[PDB]
């Protein structure tokens, strides 16, 4: 058979590839003006009989999201007031204003020497800090400083710029496409039998949290557990719920915001008086939608692990507060909530609310890096936020006694997991339209 | 019957051009991550019988290298500490701790009050400074200031960044190529009888030095003397050796390094006490190798200069230390070594060593501008430098009587010469693939 | 029989478009050949106020302005309590209270030392901090830092040319009677615009394009009161401005390589800065403007040129830059007349500011260092900006006064001749084949 080589251009063939993606929007820290608005025109191929294999963990689309958002934070906070002029000693006392026992010693009235509009004169303010914002010196009772003045300068003001996790869509460049999985039980453990394509992904809200994943994409049918290696206790387990759990969080204190000028057009905002009494910040998870919901996580664990196995949910391991508590952003203010009332029960194979206490920090290390620090501004009045628990980040402990008592704890200080939990449906491929084939000519 | 104009596309034709070259590699100041790894394959196209004319001193490839090295320094020096808060009165005398005679007056023990993490606290800090870095204040007897506080701020700590001369490759953009000279005897001007082309040059180590060129390309066969105008005085004579001369430099003092904070994450490093007796820093140049090497240079000078001419080598002319001494970086430290024992002879018509004393300097301007300054952090312990003398930068004494006995002395005040010496082999050429020739059709 | 689709490539068709333009100067070098291409018989409808070249010029000039101030000394260390009295140097009656002799404590290269520095300031740059009227501060120390260094960098209006990017062209209108009242019947294609001098002004248009046949009036809506009227003259009016004070420029360091410049003692008697406008020329100029206003406003009536109404000094008086210092000159002698339907100079007194706020924004401040010796300016008034009063008794006797200090209105008078079009070379048409 004297057959002849030929070339076809426009052949629908994919290669795995790594490229950059466009930011597509739908001031603000995330959806900045340097992001492309797009038409409400999602497109797909009406899923055909294409089988593809892809996974999580090794998906570089996650790494691009992580690095790209750091680059927004590092620019959004540059044109703000440096708080270096406030790294002074403080004379602090207890606040004494109808404080509940649980908040005793939680607030400190501190009195400091601040610079002002003129360089040769100074003034004396009287602001309230949370105990977690301040570190003592000399084992004194009256000699305090801000917690991060002995590391990179604390920089933060810009109360006009929102931290709200407004969704961002990712779009591929021409010549590239994003594959989208439509399986209901998709995991990274092999191929996705039913796939389609998009040019742009759905929007992802860059919600910051460490133990409970908030305001994400809910599983369509069943609770699903995903991990890189379930056997290896060094890996995190990402659990996606198929039913949301409503969590109501608040800081029930009618705080007054005061403002002084530090320097040449450099404003500083500082909690300056508290109307009413002092109460502890807290979050409410209904027992009714938590005690049974957790049992679905357990039902799935029983398929990955042996059945007729006793498991336990324990509280977190401790260490840095940021990796021990449920860290999240509520209205621009940072919360560090205890999870001990959510992960205490044990399970065997054979309405009321859960109230958990919260503490608040203003001075935080926003990321795992320690070369930056920020003082979140105070918020006028009382803040309340309602959010959906979409999933959990769990750590399984190690060791083995009679192959039983598997203990799980909330944990994990890495935020890559917060995007792995939503970008699991997408892969980036390159199209190579030039194909070679045998024919007759 | 006549000839027609026809067009040929893909014609091997060259034109002179100047373009932007890519930085390619294989953190640092120079070998930064924002530089593209080269293709490991030495894809030369080999030699063909082409005789291209090219030269040195009119070559813009070197000028582009010069600009990039300076810009990279500014990028690395900018995002670091400022030492402005240290422009204070220093109270010091020549306090010694078994300092030898050769070092009398080289070190001063200065007490001053540095600022600290908090505005309301002060340091009492002792710092041992090299004499070249401080000056009398008001010409008093015991009042000193850092030498550069009356010019712009001195800006540097950040000891984590390396100043090691990791080689940089230059690569042309598509449509361009670099013509490489394989003539072992090639001068800095005229045709190169043997030309091969490359897409990327070999790596060139951005070693910054003055009168003795260190760690560069060695001549393949013979000592080669290259100059823009060999009979002038306004041009430098750049001499490439065909044998390395081994040089070993050291600061035999076990220095302790201490640090304080100046401000909010603003670290400063300084020399503390020194363990052991204090000895002068020095360089050891093998005597036999140096004497044979210089004799080779003299014989080659006689091929450009006249016959039966006594050639003599004098020391440098003086003026700024930066253009009088052998100045080089080693481990991040800056040496300024004398060359008096290298250039002290007359050449007739027909395990010994040379010891060169050194005076170490901490605050430098580094280039040929005085609008900035940087402080080199000290290095803990004893430092030992091993390097190859590859070439010399010489200057001729202008003025003579009856054309006899020309005198040469070290030059090399400019930095461009350090790179001219290694880019003599390359030209940038634009390829013009579209050509026209007559034919029949 | 029937017609068959033919594709043509290289078809000369234009579409309205917005793109970036290349900024060229004497930015990239300007091509010495304008490459004007044959005036052609097309009619092109375009206008001002709906144009994009003006907005782009505004953004470009701001960026360039800031780039020249970024690498300069901040004066923040000098925002200290000042103490002062009046200057006593045969001060004329018109300069009483205009200068103050103030002392302050300046920093030095070394943290440890101070300088006792005396300098003179113009009154408009100083604010009373109360606590006894002998404790005043610089006017912008309660906003962002005031920047000053780089006396070597000029404020001169070096011409800028706008050049089309590939795929685009700039159309140029050569209609000598051109206005926004309809299309331009005389259009040429150019590669680059002529150079436009970026002269800063809030009232009179200095050193711009001149009308060639007659005085003409352009406005977005000439019958509204909410829009400004840009009047272009065809006969430049000479204006001569001066500050007849033999000054001293001194320099001190306030930090490590940080120089600060200030006004030292003034030699000679202190006199007020002023501008001279030829009276007869100004009278003829206004008469022509009036003849043109009567074509848009009811004719056979009386109209008036009135004083500005008030606001910040920047927009109430005539602000301009000359020499390297800023002037805020009163124009009361230029706009004080009515017109009836039937060697001798005008002296305009001036005020001076050293600390300047910019183009209707308050996020910065800059200090202009003083010039040594006596400064004199000569310039061409090529246009005038008018604002129409918001109604009148019996809807008659129209009155106009100075206003329109926004920077965009100055470039609208230079970029009115140009439009940016995208080239769409691909077109379809029908042929037999």
């Amino acid at each position, epitope marked *: 058979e004297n057959l002849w080589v030929t070339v076809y251009y426009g052949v629908p063939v994919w290669k795995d590839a790594e490229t950059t993606l466009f930011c597509a929007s739908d001031h603000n820290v995330w959806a900045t003006h340097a992001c492309v608005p797009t038409d409400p025109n999602p497109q797909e191929i009406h899923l055909e009989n294409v089988t593809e294999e892809f996974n999580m963990w090794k998906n570089n689309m996650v790494e691009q999201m992580h690095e790209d958002i750091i680059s927004l934070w590092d620019q959004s906070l540059k044109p703000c007031v440096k708080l270096t*002029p406030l790294c002074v000693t403080l004379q602090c006392t207890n606040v004494t204003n109808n404080i509940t026992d649980d908040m005793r010693g939680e607030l400190k009235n501190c009195s400091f*020497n601040a*610079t002002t509009e003129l*360089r*040769n*004169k*100074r003034q*004396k303010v*009287y602001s309230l800090f949370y105990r977690l914002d301040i570190v003592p010196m000399g084992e004194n009772s009256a000699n305090y400083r801000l917690i991060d003045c002995n590391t990179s300068a604390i920089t933060q003001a810009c109360p006009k710029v929102s931290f709200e996790p407004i969704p961002i869509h990712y779009c591929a460049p021409a010549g590239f496409a994003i594959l989208k999985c439509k399986d209901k039980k998709f995991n990274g453990t092999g191929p996705c039998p039913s796939v389609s394509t998009v040019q742009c992904t759905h929007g992802i809200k860059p919600v910051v949290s460490t133990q409970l994943l908030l305001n994400g994409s809910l599983a369509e049918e069943e609770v699903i557990i995903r991990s890189e290696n379930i056997t290896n206790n060094a890996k995190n387990i990402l659990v996606q719920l198929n039913t949301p759990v409503q969590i109501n969080c608040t800081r029930p204190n009618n705080n007054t915001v005061k403002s002084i000028r530090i*320097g040449p057009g450099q404003a500083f905002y500082y909690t300056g008086d508290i109307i009413g009494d002092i109460r502890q910040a807290h979050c409410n998870v209904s027992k009714a939608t938590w005690n049974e919901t957790l049992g679905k996580v357990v039902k799935q664990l029983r398929k990955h692990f042996g059945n007729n196995t006793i498991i336990r949910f324990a509280q977190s391991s401790g260490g840095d507060l940021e990796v021990t508590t449920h860290s999240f952003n509520c209205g621009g203010e940072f919360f560090y909530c205890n999870t001990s009332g959510l992960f205490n029960s044990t399970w065997i194979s054979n309405n009321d609310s859960i109230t958990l206490p919260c503490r608040i920090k203003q001075i935080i290390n926003m990321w795992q890096r320690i070369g930056q620090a920020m003082y979140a501004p105070p918020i006028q009045g009382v803040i309340r936020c309602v959010s959906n628990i979409t999933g959990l980040i769990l750590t399984r402990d190690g060791g083995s006694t009679n192959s039983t008592t598997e203990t799980f704890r909330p944990g994990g200080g890495d935020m890559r997991d917060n995007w792995r939990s939503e970008l699991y449906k997408y892969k980036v491929v390159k199209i190579e339209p030039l194909g070679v084939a045998p024919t007759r000519c | 019957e006549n000839l027609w104009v026809t067009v040929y596309y893909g014609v091997p034709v060259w034109k002179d051009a100047e373009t932007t070259l890519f930085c390619a590699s294989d953190h640092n100041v120079w070998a930064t991550h924002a530089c593209v790894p080269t293709d490991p394959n030495p894809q030369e196209i080999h030699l063909e019988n082409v005789t291209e004319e090219f030269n040195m001193w009119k070559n813009n490839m070197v000028e582009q290298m010069h600009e990039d090295i300076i810009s990279l320094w500014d990028q690395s020096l900018k995002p670091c500490v400022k030492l402005t*808060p240290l422009c204070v009165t220093l109270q010091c005398t020549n306090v010694t701790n078994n300092i030898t005679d050769d070092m009398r007056g080289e070190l001063k023990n200065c007490s001053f*009050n540095a*600022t600290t993490e908090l*505005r*309301n606290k*002060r340091q009492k800090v002792y710092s041992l400074f090299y004499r070249l870095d401080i000056v009398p204040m008001g010409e008093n007897s015991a009042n000193y200031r850092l030498i550069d506080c009356n010019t712009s701020a001195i800006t540097q700590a950040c000891p984590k960044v390396s100043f090691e001369p990791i080689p940089i490759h230059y690569c042309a953009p598509a449509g361009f190529a670099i013509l490489k000279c394989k003539d072992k005897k090639f001068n800095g001007t005229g045709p190169c009888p043997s030309v091969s082309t490359v897409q990327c040059t070999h790596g060139i180590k951005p070693v910054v030095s003055t009168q003795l060129l260190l760690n560069g390309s060695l001549a393949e066969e013979e000592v080669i003397i290259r100059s823009e105008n060999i009979t002038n005085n306004a041009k430098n004579i750049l001499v490439q050796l065909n044998t390395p001369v081994q040089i070993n430099c050291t600061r035999p003092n076990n220095n302790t390094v201490k640090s304080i904070r100046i401000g909010p994450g603003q670290a400063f490093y300084y020399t503390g006490d020194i363990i052991g007796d204090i000895r002068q820093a020095h360089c050891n140049v093998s005597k036999a190798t140096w004497n044979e090497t210089l004799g080779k240079v003299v014989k080659q000078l006689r091929k450009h200069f006249g016959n039966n001419t006594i050639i003599r080598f004098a020391q440098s002319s003086g003026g700024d230390l930066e253009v009088t001494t052998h100045s080089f970086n080693c481990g991040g430290e800056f040496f300024y070594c004398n060359t008096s024992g290298l250039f002290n002879s007359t050449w007739i018509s027909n395990n010994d060593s040379i010891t060169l004393p050194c005076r170490i300097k901490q605050i430098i301007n580094m280039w040929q501008r005085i609008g900035q300054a940087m402080y080199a952090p000290p290095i803990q312990g004893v430092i030992r430098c091993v390097s190859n003398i590859t070439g010399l930068i010489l200057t001729r004494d202008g003025g003579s009587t009856n054309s006899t006995t020309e005198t040469f002395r070290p030059g090399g005040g400019d930095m461009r010469d350090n790179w001219r010496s290694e880019l003599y082999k390359y030209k940038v050429v634009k390829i013009e693939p579209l050509g026209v020739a007559p034919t029949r059709c | 029989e029937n017609l068959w689709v033919t594709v043509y490539y290289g078809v000369p068709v234009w579409k309205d478009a917005e793109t970036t333009l290349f900024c060229a100067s004497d930015c990239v070098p300007t091509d010495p050949n304008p490459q004007e291409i044959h005036l052609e018989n097309v009619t092109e409808e375009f206008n001002m106020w709906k144009n994009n070249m003006v907005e782009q010029m505004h953004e470009d000039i701001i960026s360039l302005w800031d780039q020249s101030l970024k690498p300069c000394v901040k004066l*923040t*260390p000098l925002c200290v*309590t000042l103490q002062c009295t009046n200057v006593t140097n045969n001060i004329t009656d018109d300069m009483r209270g205009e200068l103050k002799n103030c002392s302050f*404590n300046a*920093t030095t290269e070394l*943290r*440890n030392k*101070r300088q006792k520095v005396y300098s003179l300031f113009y009154r408009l740059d100083i604010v009373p901090m109360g*606590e*006894n009227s002998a404790n005043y501060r610089l006017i912008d120390c309660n906003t962002s830092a005031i920047t000053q260094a780089c006396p070597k960098v000029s404020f001169e209006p070096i011409p800028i040319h706008y050049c089309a990017p590939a795929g685009f062209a700039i159309l140029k209108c050569k209609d000598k009677k051109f206005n926004g009242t309809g299309p331009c019947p005389s259009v040429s294609t150019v590669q680059c615009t002529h150079g436009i001098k970026p002269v800063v002004s809030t009232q009179l248009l200095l050193n711009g394009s001149l009308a060639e046949e007659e005085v003409i009036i352009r406005s977005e809506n000439i019958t509204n009161n909410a829009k400004n009227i840009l009047v272009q003259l065809n006969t430049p009016v000479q204006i001569n401005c001066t500050r007849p004070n033999n000054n001293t420029v001194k320099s001190i360091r306030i930090g490590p390589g940080q120089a600060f410049y200030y006004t030292g003692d003034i030699i000679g008697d202190i006199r007020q800065a002023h501008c001279n406008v030829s009276k007869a020329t100004w009278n003829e100029t206004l008469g022509k403007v009036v003849k043109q206003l009567r074509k848009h406003f009811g004719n056979n009536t009386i109209i008036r040129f009135a004083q500005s109404s008030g606001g910040d000094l920047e927009v109430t008086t005539h602000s301009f830059n000359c020499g390297g210092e800023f002037f805020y000159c009163n124009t009361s002698g230029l706009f004080n007349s009515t017109w009836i339907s039937n060697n001798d100079s005008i002296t305009l007194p001036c005020r001076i500011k050293q600390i300047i706020n910019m183009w209707q924004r308050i996020g910065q401040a800059m200090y202009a260092p003083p010039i040594q010796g006596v400064i004199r300016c000569v310039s061409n008034i090529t246009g005038l900006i008018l604002t129409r009063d918001g109604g009148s008794t019996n809807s008659t006797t129209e009155t106009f006064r100075p206003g329109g200090g926004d920077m965009r209105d100055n470039w609208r008078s230079e970029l009115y001749k140009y439009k940016v079009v995208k080239i769409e070379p691909l077109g379809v048409a029908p042929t037999r084949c």
Partner: antibody
Amino acid sequence: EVQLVESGGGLVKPGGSLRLSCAASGFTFSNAWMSWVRQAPGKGLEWVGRIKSKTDGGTTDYAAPVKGRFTISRDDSKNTLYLQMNSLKTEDTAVYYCTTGVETYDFWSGYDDHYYDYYFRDVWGKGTTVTV
Amino acid sequence: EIVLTQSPGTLSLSPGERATLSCRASQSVSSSYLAWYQQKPGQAPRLLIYGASSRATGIPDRFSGSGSGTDFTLTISRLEPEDFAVYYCQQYGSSFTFGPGTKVDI
């Protein structure tokens, strides 16, 4: 002008009341805590009482002979003080002075704060009398 | 209320002599709360020294003080005619209880 305004003059009877007042601009309440001192002819100085400025609270301390019905107050608008007197006693036959002081700082830098001049000036009135 | 009893009460020295003044109290207050004033006859008093050793502005260098528990002192190294005044010791222990006053005569 570092001079307190004097007031509180006039004729009263012991079987009545008297209100004294004082103070001035410059040495304003935002920078000062103020007090009253009295002196009978032939006697030394006696402290009457002191009132703190707005910021730190304003709690007023008094000397025993003037407690309860001879109080001190702070205006907070025109920077003036008042001293209320009632049912005058023979020990009240004294000159009543208005007095306070300002600690003034003038820093040479907006960075370190140990390179600063310092001034501590007290200002006194001339004193009024109580016609017991 | 700290009780002060100025020991000299009646000091008499020619101009040019050292007027050593002394005051004493049984109550213990830190030396920070020691203050001396100078009262010219017919005039309101003025503060010389506060905080035992710290000096008020407008005061000659000849004026210096010290003190601790009960024994507090003021030194005027050389009297000038302008210094013949009654001096007062003040113990600012939350109450400015003054001593009786020490007259310095010729």
